[PDB]
Enzyme design. Structure first.
Site, mmCIF file in Angstrom:
data_model
loop_
_atom_site.group_PDB
_atom_site.id
_atom_site.type_symbol
_atom_site.label_atom_id
_atom_site.label_comp_id
_atom_site.label_asym_id
_atom_site.label_seq_id
_atom_site.Cartn_x
_atom_site.Cartn_y
_atom_site.Cartn_z
ATOM 1 C CG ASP A 25 -2.081 0.880 1.024
ATOM 2 O OD1 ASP A 25 -1.958 1.701 -0.031
ATOM 3 O OD2 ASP A 25 -3.072 0.842 1.808
ATOM 4 C CB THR A 26 2.011 3.398 -2.724
ATOM 5 O OG1 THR A 26 1.069 3.524 -3.654
ATOM 6 C CG2 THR A 26 3.015 2.315 -3.220
ATOM 7 N N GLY A 27 -0.468 4.028 -0.542
ATOM 8 C CA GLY A 27 -0.980 5.104 0.147
ATOM 9 C C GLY A 27 -0.809 5.342 1.648
#
Ligand SMILES: CC(C)CN(C[C@@H](O)[C@H](Cc1ccccc1)NC(=O)O[C@H]1CO[C@H]2OCC[C@H]21)S(=O)(=O)c1ccc(N)cc1
Lengths: 99, 99
Positions: A25-27
């Site tokens: 999850d880059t967020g």
């Protein structure tokens, strides 16, 4: 490896001697796992999402292994709907976004 | 380009004639944008995440432009704390995770 995004980016991690699947999850700024049996002390903390906040237990200096890579860092344990690997870990395995 | 994850993977997007900063979010199936002025029809929808859920307006076949690359698809508008570019758009611009 190289990972397209047509499916959820799930990866197998090993943490606390346990095997789990988690989302890359880059967020996510930090790593949050569903309720799990971790050893050691921990300080409370709240993290916010798109629907509000949850209270979690923050564990420091926890070893995670991802697809053959190893990382040590903060792991948050609480009522997340999905295990999420955040940027704090993905930087340590050399994960990048490419387009 | 290639993007390390030591900071938020923010990008600039052009949508509905407006410029906005958005977070590339491999953990998001759909694109969700803060309250903004969009033209067209829509259908109510609810999306969930950490902390609960939120009400959004679902816009379909919406044009998004990120770093020149063009994409067209579903854009959800509602009370998200952060503009999110989800996998439904990142797949169109050829975005991949690499480690
Ligand atoms: C939790 C995931 C399965 C889904 N989420 C994407 C995720 O990246 C969110 C996206 C996000 C980002 C910022 C603010 C709210 C939500 N980030 C997040 O919750 O991270 C939290 C844990 O570490 C911290 O990092 C930032 C917030 C904390 S989500 O925002 O709720 C979401 C869910 C469904 C859709 N269609 C689009 C987005």
């Amino acid at each position: 490896p190289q990972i397209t995004l047509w499916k959820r980016p799930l990866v197998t991690i090993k943490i606390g001697g346990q095997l789990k699947e988690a989302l890359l999850d880059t967020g996510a700024d930090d790593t949050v796992l569903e309720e799990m049996n971790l050893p050691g002390r921990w300080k409370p903390k709240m993290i916010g999402g798109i629907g509000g906040f949850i209270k979690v237990r923050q564990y420091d200096q926890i070893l995670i292994e991802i697809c053959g890579h190893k990382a040590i860092g903060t792991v948050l344990v609480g009522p997340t709907p999905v295990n999420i690997i955040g940027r704090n870990v993905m930087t340590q395995i050399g994960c990048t976004l490419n387009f």
